[PDB]
Ligand binder design. Structure first.
Ligand SMILES: [Zn+2]
Lengths: 53, 125, 102, 52, 323, 56, 155
């Protein structure tokens, strides 16, 4: 899914599109037309301190 | 002529709050240097989104050009574009900003959309 | 006041560009008197929303607002940028222990 | 079948504050007044272009 | 030399024949109460209903045989109609796949293009061109608007003086120039001085005002009762008063009680005076005699007659629950 | 030379009849429903197709 | 669209003469020359526009004795335009049926001066049309985000 720079650049493009949480990372999922999927760019779901800042 | 690296420095914040004659306007929020080609790109991209039946795009190009290549050194609050009505069409803020949104990316520094009359620079900044 | 640009300089330690002695309304009004010879009640000054909580505190170009109270008696309109306000322009420069205060 | 309709007195007995329509036309009054000062705003911004 | 009806403002309906046969052909089949799965609209000529592309396709789209509607429409519409009149036919199809169609007079665009003696694509919006299309008097607009009522059962409603503006404004929107309006003067009268014209105008307009007034009075008398109840003005309320009144219920209902006609039930000084002073505690409208409260706050779209009736203690003193 | 404001001889500190137009785009709080509308739940508007179709 | 438009255009029939005093043709010109120019808009943008199809006779154009070709039924005779005062509220409409820019009605209401009592209603219906425009998108923005004027206009 395309990664938006921040939460403000995140819009709901269709009728069926939703806001969802991927482990504290806010994202948009459409059960129809998956090309509408948007992630907020943020840390990986699994990160250590030295590995990711 | 043959001006040094420190000349016409944009870095100061100006006291002049511009007056925009057009119904809407696009105004410099930061300091910077803008190429002519960038403003031409902006102009074309904005003219794509205008209802040419009711509107006219005015570009303020009359500022000095400084050697680098010739570009503009822009202070905060310098107006760039103006949406001027030919008729009774009154845009909202969403609409005007939606129009200038096309041409914002080509411009390298931050810009604000300001409504007719004098810039209220308490609200803008 | 708006034509004038008040030069300001102080000391900065740490990494990002912060003053270790942030500004407040009693010493903005001080610089006004020091170099512009402008005497105003310091309680007419108001900061930006971001600078109310910590003071001014950051290096470089900052602006602040001065409230000029009485004019509708004088019929002040359209000959100024707005009837109640002046953008007071501060510039904070970091200098070492030789040239700075505080 | 005889229809002798509810009369003015009978029905006006039940007259009463109706908060639904009160709230509604309060909101609509607010809206027409903000449209009012929106037009007023455009006027003021246009006359702000007048030389001093 | 002849002038047909010289009387103050009774040319309202069209003549008899048109009214009654427009009644028995343009008409309302009563709504059966089913779930509508299609509301269809067509422009169909009087003598000819066809099984061709639009109607045949949409009826075969449901599997319905389109011949029946066509035959019924031709049987109903071929008599009584002059040729080349395209009619609005609204077919409503329910969940039983049984339908009901209404026949309605041609659209306003049709009447305007008839009355202006203009064919299609001869007229457009003014800024698109920069010149008006054909001149029109407001006399013609009435005889356009006479033809379209809301309900043919009752031609009077809605009232011409209002609904004419729909025609005027749509013609406007078409690019029609106008006389009464959008030009300063009224089309010249051969036989009279200008001051005679205007003196005629100043009495005639108020005669029409009176007639209109009584008309919407008995209009409102035909209506259900709740419109004759009290909806007070919110505008005379100082906008902070309105929003703080929306913040708590008591300000608005105490207000409503305070400004109300003096009817037997709600005329109580004991519950009124403390209501007024309860309003005046918080800086609500304080320069008020209660009887001017009954004037400033009243339903404003309520017509003149029943509002002076409500203002008057005598006429409203009579409505009392008997037993 | 020192510079100081004149006193107030007459009238208010903040210009009333001389107000500068406020520079925001004037969207009514009730016209665009976003925030700052404190409306008692008894008075809730615009339900015309949800709960204000079956009023009272 | 080519639907619901007259495919034929019959003519006018002038049934009775509205006047008994016949005009000189110079009167017929001086009234017509007065008609060819009209005003468009009522506000600061207000422009004179020349009117196409200005009739030969101004005196006899719409005001009496003319039968409109709007007839529909078989036995429907072309309706004859009657006298002015028999048409209800026409003088009252002439005052109020005109383009009313919102700002301008508003200022009249504030000054408590209306050309007709009805211009209240003219105002109240304008507001309701504007707010509806606001209320529509707010039902459309709900279902899906709709961004105002980002698409390229025309080709
Ligand atoms: Zn999508």
């Amino acid at each position: 899914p395309q990664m938006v720079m921040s939460r403000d650049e995140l819009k709901l493009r269709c009728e069926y599109c939703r806001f969802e949480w991927i482990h504290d990372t806010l994202c948009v999922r459409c059960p129809a037309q998956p090309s509408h999927d948007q992630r907020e760019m943020w840390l990986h779901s699994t990160w250590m301190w030295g590995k990711q800042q | 002529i043959r001006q040094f690296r420190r000349y016409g420095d944009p870095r100061y914040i100006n006291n002049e709050a511009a007056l925009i004659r057009g119904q809407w306007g696009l105004i410099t929020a930061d300091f910077g240097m803008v190429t002519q080609s960038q403003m031409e790109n902006a102009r074309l991209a904005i003219l794509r989104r205008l209802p040419r039946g009711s509107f006219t795009l005015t570009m303020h190009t009359d500022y000095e050009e400084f050697p680098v290549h010739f570009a503009f050194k822009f202070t905060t609050g310098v107006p760039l574009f103006e949406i001027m009505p030919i008729s009774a069409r009154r845009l909202n803020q969403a609409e005007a900003e939606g129009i200038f949104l096309a041409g914002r990316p080509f411009i390298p520094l931050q810009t604000v959309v300001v409504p007719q009359g004098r810039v209220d620079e308490y609200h803008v900044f | 006041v708006n034509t004038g640009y008040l030069l300001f300089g102080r000391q900065s330690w740490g990494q990002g560009f912060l003053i270790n002695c942030p500004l407040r309304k009693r010493d903005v009004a001080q610089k006004l008197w020091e170099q512009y010879k402008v005497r105003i009640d310091p309680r007419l000054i108001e900061f930006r929303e971001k600078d109310r909580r910590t003071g001014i505190q950051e290096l470089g170009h900052n602006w602040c607002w001065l409230y000029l109270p009485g004019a509708e008696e004088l019929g002040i309109n359209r000959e100024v940028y707005d009837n109640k306000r002046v953008k007071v322009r501060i510039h904070v420069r970091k200098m070492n222990s030789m040239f700075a205060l505080y | 079948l005889q229809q002798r309709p509810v009369t003015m007195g009978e029905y006006r007995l039940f007259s009463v504050p109706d908060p639904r329509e009160l709230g509604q036309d309060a909101v609509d009054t607010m809206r027409r007044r903000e449209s009012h000062n929106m037009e007023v705003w455009w006027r003021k911004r246009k006359e702000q272009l007048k030389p001093p | 030399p002849k002038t047909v009806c010289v009387e103050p403002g009774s040319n309202r309906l069209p003549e008899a024949l048109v009214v009654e046969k427009a009644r028995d052909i343009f008409g309302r089949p009563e709504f059966p109460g089913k779930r509508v799965l299609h509301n269809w609209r067509f422009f169909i000529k009087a003598g000819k209903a066809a099984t061709g592309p639009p109607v045949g396709q949409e009826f075969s789209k449901l599997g319905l045989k389109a011949m029946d509607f066509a035959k019924v429409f031709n049987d109903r519409t071929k008599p009584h109609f002059k040729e080349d009149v395209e009619l609005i036919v609204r077919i409503q199809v329910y969940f039983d796949k049984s339908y009901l169609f209404t026949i309605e007079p041609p659209p306003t665009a049709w009447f305007i293009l008839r009355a202006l003696r203009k064919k299609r694509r001869e007229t457009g919006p003014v800024p698109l061109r920069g010149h008006y299309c054909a001149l029109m008097t407001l006399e013609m607009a009435y005889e356009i608007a006479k033809m379209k009522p809301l309900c043919w059962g009752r031609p009077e409603y809605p009232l011409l003086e209002t609904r004419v503006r729909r025609v005027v404004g749509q013609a406007r929107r078409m690019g029609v120039c106008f006389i009464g309006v959008d030009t300063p003067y009224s089309s010249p009268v051969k036989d009279m001085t200008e001051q005679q014209y205007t003196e005629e105008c100043e009495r005639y307009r108020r005669i029409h005002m009176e007639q209109y007034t009584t008309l919407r009075q008995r209009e409102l008398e035909e209506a259900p009762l709740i419109e004759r109840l009290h909806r007070p003005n919110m505008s005379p309320l100082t906008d902070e008063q309105i929003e703080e009144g929306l913040r708590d219920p008591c300000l608005l209902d105490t207000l409503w009680r305070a400004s109300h006609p003096l009817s037997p039930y709600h005329r109580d000084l004991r519950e009124r005076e403390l209501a007024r002073r309860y309003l005046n505690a918080r800086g609500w409208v304080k320069d008020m005699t209660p009887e001017e409260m009954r004037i400033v706050f009243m339903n404003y779209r309520l017509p003149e007659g029943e509002k002076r009736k409500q203002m008057d203690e005598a006429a409203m003193s009579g409505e009392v629950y008997w037993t | 030379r020192y510079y100081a404001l004149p006193h107030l001889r007459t009238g208010p500190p903040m210009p009333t009849t001389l107000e500068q137009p406020s520079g925001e785009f004037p969207w009514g709080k009730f016209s665009t429903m976003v925030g700052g509308t404190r409306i008692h739940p008894l008075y809730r508007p615009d339900g015309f197709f949800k709960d204000n179709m079956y009023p009272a | 669209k080519r639907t619901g438009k007259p495919a034929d255009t019959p003519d006018y029939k002038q049934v009775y003469l509205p006047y008994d005093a016949a005009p000189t043709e110079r009167e017929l010109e001086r009234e017509r020359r007065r008609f060819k120019q009209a005003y468009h808009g009522r506000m600061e943008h207000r422009k004179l526009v020349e009117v196409k199809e200005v009739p030969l006779n101004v005196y006899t154009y719409g005001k009496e004795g003319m039968s409109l070709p709007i007839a529909i039924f078989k036995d429907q005779k072309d309706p004859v335009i009657g006298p002015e005062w028999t048409y209800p509220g026409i003088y009252e409409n002439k005052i109020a049926a005109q383009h009313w820019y919102t700002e301008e009605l508003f200022d009249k209401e504030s000054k408590e001066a209306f050309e007709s009592p009805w211009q209240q209603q003219i105002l109240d219906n304008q507001v309701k049309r504007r707010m509806a425009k606001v209320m529509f998108r707010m039902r459309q923005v709900n279902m899906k985000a709709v961004d105002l004027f980002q698409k390229e206009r025309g080709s």
